Amino acid sequence: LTGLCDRFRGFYPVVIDVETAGFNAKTDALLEIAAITLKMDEQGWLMPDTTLHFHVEPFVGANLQPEALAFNGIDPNDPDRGAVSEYEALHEIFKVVRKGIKASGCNRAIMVAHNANFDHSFMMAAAERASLKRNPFHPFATFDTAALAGLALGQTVLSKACQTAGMDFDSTQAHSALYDTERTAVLFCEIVNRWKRLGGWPLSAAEEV
Amino acid sequence: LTGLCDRFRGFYPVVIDVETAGFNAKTDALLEIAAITLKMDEQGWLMPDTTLHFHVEPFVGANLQPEALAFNGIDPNDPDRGAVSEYEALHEIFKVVRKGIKASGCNRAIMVAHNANFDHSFMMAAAERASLKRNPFHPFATFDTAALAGLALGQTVLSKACQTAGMDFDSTQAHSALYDTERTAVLFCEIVNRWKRLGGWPLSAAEEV
Ligand SMILES: [Co+2]
Ligand SMILES: [Mg+2]
Ligand SMILES: [Mg+2]
C-alpha cells in the first residue's frame, strides 16, 4: 500500500529541470540540468531522496540563441562555470536512477517537470547525442507539474503555484536548474501528499472514516 | 468563485484527441480530431459542454506510415469516410472555442489530452498548415490526463485510468478520436470534481468543516 512502486503503477518519478540556449531541443545547447529522485517513507509519504546538479558544456555544433542567454544569464564561455559533458552528467543521473528503480521495486523512471515536454525533449535529445544505452526514462510519458498545480492549486505558473502552496520562491534564483528542480520537487510532493492527507489516496481511504 | 474562469487562472479547458498516420506531427497526416469544451454549473461542478468530431483528409504531401494505419484501422482512401479538410475541421473547433472563452470570461484555451504533448503537436501543426489566425490555444501549456490520472487514480494508461475511476471502456472503440475524447473528458471531469468533493477545492474548503 505505502510503497513507491505501488503509487504510480511502477513508475519511479524523478524531478528534472534544464536550462538551455534556446527553444529547440534538437539544435540548441543544453546548459544546465538537475535531478531529484523521490522516496516514500514507511507510512507512504513522498519526499526528495537524492539530488544531482550540473553545468553542462554545449555540444559540438550546438546553436546558442542570444535571447536565451540574455534570459537565463548563463555565459557558456566562462571557464569558471565548472561545466561537464552531456555524457558525464546524464551517465551520472542514469546510474543513480537505475539504482533507485531497483531498490524501490519500480520498473521504469518517469520525468516530473514543469511544462514537462520541454525538459523531456532536451534530456532525451542529449541522451541520444551522448549515445547512452538503456535510458531508464519512459520515452514519452511525463508528470507535468503545471497541469498538476492546475488541478491542486488553480495555478499553472511555477512561482505562483509554489506561493499558493505556501512555499517560498526566490526570483533571483529562478534561472538556476537546481533551484527550480528543488522547488518543483517540493511542489510535487506537497500535491501528492495533500491528496493522500485529504483521503484521496489510497482509493480505499474514502470509505474508512 | 464557482465560475470556470476562476478554476484554472483564466484557462478554458478543451479536451482534444487525434488519430494520425504516424508519430511525427510535422510530416505525418492528421486523420481524425474531436474536441469537447467543458462548462461549470452554478455550484462549480465541471461537465462536458459542446462536442465536435471530424474525419480529416490527409494534407497534400503528408506521409502515411503503414504501421500507423494498421494500428488505428483507418483507410484514408475510403471515399465513404466523410472526411473534411484540416482547415474545415480546425476552423469550426476554433470558432466554438472562441465563443466559449468569451461566454465564460476566460482568456485562453488550454488543451486537455492523454499524453497531451502528442495531440498538442499535431493540432498545432495542422493549424499552421491551414494558415489559421488567432489560434485560441496556449502555445505550450497543456493538461495531461495521464499525469492527472497518475495523481488521482494511480494509473497512467487511458483504459485503466477510466476503469479505476469506475467508468466503462470499450476497447473496440479505442481507435476513434471521438470515443477517446469523450472518455478523456469524463475522466478529467471526474478527477476535477472528486478533488472538489473531497475538500481540496476551493482552497478555503479544508478549514470550513
Ligand atoms: Co469511416
Ligand atoms: Mg524550467
Ligand atoms: Mg490518443
Swiss-Prot record, chains A, B:
Outcome of gene disruption:
Required for optimal growth. Significantly slowed cell growth, increased expression of sodB reporter construct.
Note the site residues: Important for substrate binding and specificity: F23, E67, F71, F118, F140
Q: What is the effect of changing D144A?
A: Nearly abolishes enzyme activity
Q: Does the keyword Nuclease apply?
A: yes
Among the entry's GO cellular component annotations, what is one? cytosol
Q: How is the cofactor bound?
A: Binds two Mg(2+) per subunit. The active form of the enzyme binds two Mg(2+) ions in its active site. The first Mg(2+) forms only one salt bridge with the protein.
Any one of the GO BP annotations: DNA replication proofreading
Active site per UniProt? H175 (proton donor/acceptor)
Top enzyme category: hydrolase
Report quaternary structure and partners.
Homodimer.
Its biological function?
A: Trims short 3' overhangs of a variety of RNA species, leaving a one or two nucleotide 3' overhang. Responsible for the end-turnover of tRNA: specifically removes the terminal AMP residue from uncharged tRNA (tRNA-C-C-A). Also appears to be involved in tRNA biosynthesis, especially in strains lacking other exoribonucleases. A general regulator of small RNAs (sRNA), contributes to their degradation. Upon overexpression suppresses sRNA-mediated RhyB-silencing of multiple RNA targets; overexpression leads to nearly complete loss of RhyB sRNA.
Descriptive protein name? Ribonuclease T
Organism, scientific name: Escherichia coli (strain K12)
Q: Which gene encodes it?
A: rnt
